[PDB]
Design a protein around this ligand. Structure first.
Ligand SMILES: OC[C@H]1O[C@H](O[C@H]2[C@H](O)[C@@H](O)[C@@H](O)O[C@@H]2CO)[C@H](O)[C@@H](O)[C@@H]1O
Length: 392
């Protein structure tokens, strides 16, 4: 009869975010001797499928850094334990209520808001200043023109957009639409507004200053390597702030300009809301569940979140965690303003599963393998399988 051996499957950045969390794991083990936590970093791309496999069978973890979109999905699948009336939610009033709504499923909370974020048009102030530009482009049409001016002046590419569906979601919000209509229940991916929205996204690869699409699976890493070293601007979240400062372009932290994503035909801009929630596995024995409820209370404390914000530059979920040290950081202050345009996700557990087919079909459209209506038509049929309550 020794201590309780827990296992936390972390999905954060292994270089920037993991060291900060590995330090908090030791702080909990130092204060609580009867509990031991086994740190395991699982790549984000594989974390959803790996947990879905393990949760039903054996080798499942006790705690999981679940994404805000996977929490209602795994809560629907019965893998997560409900945290209503537990020591993990002792400070339920301190968190943002909108983030507690994302963790909820069928009127019951299955996760504790750990971190939060949204995409934002990050840019290089030196290259924009050298190109005779003061402010960031307000619309997608201004971004196309701004890139050609930056290319003509400096000779560096003005913009390199991501081929992924999560990043392409900002265009649907820009043109006044979404992937699906939940109240009416209908697939709006092959609709008038989506065809135009994706048409604008597809148009941002071709042009002077605009970098062409990359069909590789690791395209994401090329977009960081380019922007960190010095491409003029990209659409990215706050989790790469620490990664940006490591590069040669952003030695000066003030050089990193953070503006809201440009708007479309709707007038106002829009970006997808994200983040992660800590959630306990229901199949674990009652001993490990009680020990895990204590870990989440500590990990989502005012002290821990305030520390995490200073190290990782990620936005805390608690309102009390925003001190002057946190507000003084350029990154956090810059992303708190763009958070105004972050569109919350609707009450649909399969909403995140809809990006799966889109990531495949959009990479075909961007790569020049299929036409625009070809891929969107296939995505509309592939989406209908995962959610047949629409129809098209
Ligand atoms: O790709 C969409 C995805 O982006 C963000 O996920 C990050 C996350 O901050 C960390 O786990 C990081 O280490 O890697 C992920 C890479 O995507 C958002 O946090 C997430 O909501 C969104 O689905």
């Amino acid at each position: 009869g020794g201590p309780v051996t827990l296992t936390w499957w972390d999905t954060s950045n292994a270089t920037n975010e993991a060291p900060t969390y590995k330090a908090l794991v030791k702080e909990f083990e130092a204060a609580h001797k009867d509990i031991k936590v086994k740190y395991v970093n699982v790549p984000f791309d594989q974390a959803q499928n790996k947990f879905d496999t393990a949760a039903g069978a054996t080798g499942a973890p006790d705690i999981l850094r679940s994404e805000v979109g996977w929490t209602p999905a795994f809560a629907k699948k019965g893998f997560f334990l409900p945290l209503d009336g537990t020591e993990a939610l002792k400070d339920q009033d301190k968190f943002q209520p909108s983030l507690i709504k994302q963790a909820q499923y069928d009127g019951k909370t299955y996760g504790v808001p750990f971190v939060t974020d949204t995409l934002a048009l990050v840019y290089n102030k030196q290259l924009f200043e050298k190109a005779g530009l003061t402010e960031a482009p307000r619309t997608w049409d201004d971004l196309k023109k701004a890139a050609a001016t930056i290319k003509g002046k400096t000779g560096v590419d003005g913009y390199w957009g991501s081929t992924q569906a999560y990043y392409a979601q900002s265009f649907l919000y820009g043109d006044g639409t979404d992937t699906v209509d939940v109240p009416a229940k209908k697939i709006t991916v092959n609709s008038p507004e989506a065809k135009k929205a994706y048409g604008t996204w597809l148009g941002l690869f071709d042009g002077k200053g605009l970098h062409k699409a990359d069909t590789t699976a690791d395209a994401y890493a090329h977009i960081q390597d380019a922007f960190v070293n010095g491409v003029a601007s990209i659409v990215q979240g706050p989790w790469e702030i620490t990664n940006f400062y490591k590069g040669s372009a952003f030695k000066d932290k003030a050089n990193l300009g953070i503006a809201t994503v440009p708007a479309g035909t709707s007038g106002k801009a829009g970006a997808p809301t994200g983040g992660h929630n800590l959630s306990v596995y229901a199949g674990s024995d009652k001993a490990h569940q009680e020990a895990s409820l204590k870990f989440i209370e500590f990990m989502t404390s005012a002290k821990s979140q305030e520390t995490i914000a200073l190290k990782n530059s990620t936005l805390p979920t608690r309102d009390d965690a925003y001190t002057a040290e946190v507000k003084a950081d350029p990154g956090i202050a810059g992303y708190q303003t763009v958070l105004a345009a972050a569109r919350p996700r609707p009450e649909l557990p399969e909403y995140s599963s809809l990006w799966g087919p889109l990531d495949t079909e959009l990479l075909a459209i961007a790569g020049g393998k299929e036409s625009l209506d070809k891929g969107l038509g296939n995505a509309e049929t592939a989406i209908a399988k995962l959610v047949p309550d629409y129809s098209k």
